[PDB]
Design a protein around this ligand. Structure first.
Ligand SMILES: CC(C)CCC[C@@H](C)[C@H]1CC[C@H]2[C@@H]3CC=C4C[C@@H](O)CC[C@]4(C)[C@H]3CC[C@]12C
Ligand SMILES: CC(C)NC[C@H](O)COc1cccc2[nH]c3ccccc3c12
Lengths: 120, 391
């Protein structure tokens, strides 16, 4: 009975900036590893940013140095700073939550926010 | 030859001297020349044990063997001080005289071989079973849960059993003696107490951990971190190791009667003679105390699971039932043994040694049941299939 809600998406000019946030409610959050996945038009979903419970952040080579993932355990929200947005970053971003259970880790996903980058 | 016949009981110069002593004697030569090759070796077995003059004392027994009355000589050889001194040694000699075969020594030899294969399969089932559990969690990143960390700690305890306790405890029964010295005897017993104590304490941690998890919004998420889980595991082995090695290494288990002192000084004797104080205190601390709180806590976990209760819910509710079988199987396999420890100490010679060893080995087999119980969870079941069947 967990809930993931993304926010911060929308329309932005090329080279701009956006900050995505994902509210998690239904577990401890401080112990679960967060992450951000995006779905491009006609492409499979690609992991772009993921932060563990300890704070180890992993990024994708296509977004390395431009994106920055972090979290606030006081507000139960994982953030994703998006700088120097390109046309290839135009995708629907999903917030991933790896909540560990008794024997296995259960993957929970959000509804997904859409980020469109116009090259005007 | 009868070289293995004397080898099975407790050198070539003594055999040839006993054969020459029977031929020179005027009361053993007529009997030796009337027995088959099998019964002649059984006659030399008595001369090598008792003596040339002692064997001649059985005037009535040798007369019945000379008259080929095996059934009447079997009851006549049971009425002597030699039959009451060693009942296991004499019964095999009487049977050899009566049947004229090696059935008394063959059946005692096939039993060692037959039981030796069974105990070897127990070791193989424990090692292969637990190493599969260790590998399944250490490899698959989806099985990296706090409970599985304690399962790894529990499987390690059962793994050492099938590598340092069960194999050396099996040779102690087949050979009927101990052939590893006193240094390893006090160490083999220390490991034995350690792994059992570390197992019940680890299961006790799981029950408490599942209670904090079921009192959480996720109802199944452990409140411990990955680093804190390793700290608990480390402290469990430290506490259990202090309540296992220190009472043994400091010789707090030693008894006072003469039979125990003679077994402690003997390198070939490794019987676990304990005093009335240590046997109760250690069983209470290392087994009974963590057992009561484990059942009490995990019963409230089952009470909260039925009080708060989809498709996903049944999968994780069965995972709590899976851990309940682990605690239940570990209980129903070590409880009769620790009950005997209370009975054996309070009343001496009330429980047989064979029964005491049997119930001790029921707990040994328990160190190979946990991997089979983990097959109830499809998460563990798939991980096994990917490692073994699919490969
Ligand atoms: C006491 C002796 C004779 C028995 C053999 C010791 C074996 C069973 C113990 C000693 C140290 C233990 C290891 C300690 C730590 C880990 C890390 C874990 O991520 C995988 C299991 C693993 C690797 C354990 C495997 C079992 C192990 C190797
Ligand atoms: C042949 C012997 C070495 N077998 C020992 C048992 O497997 C385990 O015995 C124990 C494990 C843990 C605590 C214990 N307290 C005891 C008190 C008396 C005897 C055994 C134990 C004991």
């Amino acid at each position: 009975q967990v809930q993931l809600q993304e926010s911060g998406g929308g329309l932005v000019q090329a080279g701009g900036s956006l900050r995505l946030s994902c509210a998690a409610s239904g577990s401890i959050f401080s112990l679960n590893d967060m992450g951000w996945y995006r779905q491009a038009p006609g492409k499979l979903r690609e992991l772009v940013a993921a932060i563990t419970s300890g704070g180890s952040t992993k990024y994708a080579d296509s977004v390395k140095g431009r994106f920055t993932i972090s979290r606030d355990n006081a507000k139960n929200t994982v953030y994703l700073q998006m700088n120097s947005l390109k046309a290839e970053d135009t995708a629907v971003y999903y917030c991933n939550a790896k909540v560990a259970g008794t024997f296995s880790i259960y993957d929970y996903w959000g509804q997904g926010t859409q980020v469109t980058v116009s090259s005007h | 030859n009868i070289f293995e016949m004397l080898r099975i009981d407790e050198f070539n110069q003594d055999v040839d001297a006993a054969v020459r002593g029977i031929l020179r004697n005027a009361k053993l030569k007529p009997v030796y020349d009337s027995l088959d090759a099998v019964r002649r070796a059984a006659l030399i077995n008595m001369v090598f044990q008792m003596g040339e003059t002692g064997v001649a004392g059985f005037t009535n027994s040798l007369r019945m063997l000379q008259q080929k009355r095996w059934d009447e000589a079997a009851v006549n050889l049971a009425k002597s001080r030699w039959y009451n001194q060693t009942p296991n040694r004499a019964k095999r000699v009487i049977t050899t005289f009566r049947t004229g075969t090696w059935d008394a020594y063959a059946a005692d030899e096939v039993w060692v071989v037959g039981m030796g294969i069974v105990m070897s399969l127990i070791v193989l089932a424990i090692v292969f079973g637990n190493v599969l559990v260790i590998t399944a969690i250490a490899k698959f990143e989806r099985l990296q849960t706090v409970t599985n960390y304690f399962i790894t700690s529990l499987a390690c305890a059962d793994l050492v059993m099938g590598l340092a306790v069960v194999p050396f405890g099996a040779a102690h029964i087949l050979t009927k003696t101990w052939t590893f010295g006193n240094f390893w005897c006090e160490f083999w017993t220390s490991i034995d107490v350690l792994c059992v104590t570390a197992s019940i304490e680890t299961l006790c941690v799981i029950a408490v951990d599942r209670y904090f998890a079921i009192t959480s919004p996720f109802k199944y998420q452990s409140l411990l971190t990955k680093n804190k889980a390793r700290v608990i595991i480390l402290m469990v082995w430290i506490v259990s190791g202090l309540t296992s090695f220190l009472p043994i290494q400091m010789h707090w288990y030693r008894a006072t009667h003469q039979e125990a002192i003679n077994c402690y000084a003997e390198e070939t004797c490794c019987d676990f003679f304990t005093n009335q104080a240590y046997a109760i205190a250690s069983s209470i601390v290392s087994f009974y105390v963590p057992l009561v709180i484990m059942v009490f806590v995990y019963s409230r976990v089952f009470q909260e699971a039925k009080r708060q209760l989809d498709k996903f819910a049944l999968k994780e509710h069965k995972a709590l039932k899976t851990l309940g079988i682990i605690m239940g199987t570990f209980t129903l396999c070590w409880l009769p043994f620790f009950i005997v420890n209370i009975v054996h100490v309070i009343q001496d010679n009330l429980i047989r040694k064979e029964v005491y060893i049997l119930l001790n080995w029921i707990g040994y087999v328990n160190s190979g049941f946990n991997p089979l119980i983990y097959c109830r969870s499809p998460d563990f079941r798939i991980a096994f299939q990917e490692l073994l069947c699919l490969r």
